[PDB]
Design a binder for this molecule. Structure first.
Ligand code: NI
Length: 341
């Protein structure tokens, strides 16, 4: 049964609610982004209207085989009427195709559902600027002050400089980057650009990348592993055993691997600056964990909410424990007292 924080009161609508069967009263199912915890339940047999971005729609059709007649893509930054209710989709600064949804309820209430997001000051000049929001359904993944990490630009700077140094010292080194979902494509694209290489990957991952509307993508990626010196592999294979086994398959072309695991936050963030990060090494294999996040830091989240000044907040992440829920409620009250709304 569908939980309350996935329902939009005063409408026929749900958000990211595909794993509960036929939801009673639901006339349109919104999908914020193509990540498995959110799409869980969709398949080619789904027969209700799905509303989403163009990119999410490409993935639904090609990867999950949802039939075209049930896919309803909407442009961003554009007022649209859905089953008699005005909606707007906004870029969520998460993975490709990820949106926030603004719902203008027939009674005058305005609701923002962030989906998953990485808050940014640029959002303060979107269509959010123009009116008041009563209810915020908020991605609270990192809602605690211990969660710090650097900008995405600092992280990419570190990775580019690391890869270019290693391969210039040793032209026979291979770079490998882990992946298990869409998102974080800048990591592998930036490294391949500095090295003058295409990114090599499986047929299944190439298929997924071809759904994302990235400019000039045919110039950047390939299924011909032999022609490429940046390879993508499943995240599960980014360990000493998995990488040893991959180096065997490369036909003595390479004699060293430098690999990247983009994670979210890890507790080595509490002590170490990005500049100071070091790898784990065994023989001719080195593995860097790099803190590339597609969710808001605590400070970014706090800034956004203090700017928006919502009347009520409904968390969508970490809602399963009493300790979590109490911690989050305390920070929301601090923020409101500090800012005066
Ligand atoms: Ni996500």
């Amino acid at each position: 049964t569908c939980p309350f924080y996935k329902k939009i009161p005063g409408t026929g609508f749900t958000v990211d609610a595909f794993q509960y069967g036929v939801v009673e009263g639901c006339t349109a199912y919104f999908l914020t982004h193509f990540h498995s915890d959110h799409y869980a339940g969709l398949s080619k047999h789904f027969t209700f209207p799905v509303y989403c971005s163009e990119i999410t729609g490409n993935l639904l059709k090609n990867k999950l085989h949802v039939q075209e007649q049930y896919i309803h893509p909407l442009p961003l930054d554009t007022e649209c009427i859905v089953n008699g209710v005005k909606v707007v989709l906004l870029d969520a600064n998460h993975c490709p195709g990820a949106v926030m949804i603004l719902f203008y309820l027939p009674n005058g209430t305005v609701i923002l559902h962030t989906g998953d997001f990485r808050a940014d000051p640029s959002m303060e000049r979107s269509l959010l600027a123009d009116q008041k929001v009563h209810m915020l359904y908020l991605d609270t993944t990192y809602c605690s002050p211990e969660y710090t990490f650097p900008s995405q630009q600092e992280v990419i700077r570190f990775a580019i400089n690391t890869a270019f140094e290693a391969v210039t010292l040793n032209p026979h080194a291979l770079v490998v980057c882990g992946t298990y979902s869409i998102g974080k494509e800048k990591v592998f694209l930036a490294i391949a650009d500095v090295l003058g290489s295409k990114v090599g990957m499986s047929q299944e991952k190439y298929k997924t990348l071809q759904c994302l509307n990235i400019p000039e993508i045919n110039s950047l990626i390939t299924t011909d592993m032999c022609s490429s010196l940046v390879h993508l592999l499943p995240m599960m294979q980014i360990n000493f055993k998995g990488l040893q086994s991959h180096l065997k398959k490369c036909g003595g072309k390479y004699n060293q691997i430098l690999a990247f695991r983009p994670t979210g936050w890890t507790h080595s963030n509490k002590f170490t600056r990005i500049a100071d990060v070091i790898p784990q090494t065994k023989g001719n294999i080195s593995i860097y964990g790099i803190p590339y996040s597609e969710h808001s830091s605590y400070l970014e989240m706090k800034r956004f909410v203090q700017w928006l000044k919502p009347q009520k907040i409904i968390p969508t992440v970490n809602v399963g424990t009493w300790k979590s829920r109490s911690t989050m409620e305390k920070y929301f009250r601090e923020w409101k007292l500090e800012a005066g709304y």
